[PDB]
Symmetry: D2
Subunit: 32 residues, 4 copies
């Protein structure tokens, strides 16, 4: 097998929100 | 302010890591 | 509603294309 | 070596521009 879980530490709320939206997008689209 | 972002999959992690590290260096946001 | 983004370099393009394609699909 | 991305929507475009600009600035040896 299964995909493993990895964690990224992000500094800044605006930066986090962008990266979260990308992560969530990729989960839905499965592009990566 | 520090957050954790939990990512499924090594390839997905690698793309987000590249972006995070880039943003830390550039300070664009 | 369509905007052109100029990107320098293949690796940079390939990253951003993956994201753009993903966002097109997850835009619900 | 210029590529173009067609991005639909202001908000999406603004995110991808920030990332592009960041990756240009963090492109260091």
């Amino acid at each position: 097998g299964s995909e493993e879980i990895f964690t990224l530490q992000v500094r800044g709320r605006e930066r986090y929100e962008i990266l979260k939206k990308l992560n969530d997008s990729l989960e839905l689209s499965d592009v990566v």
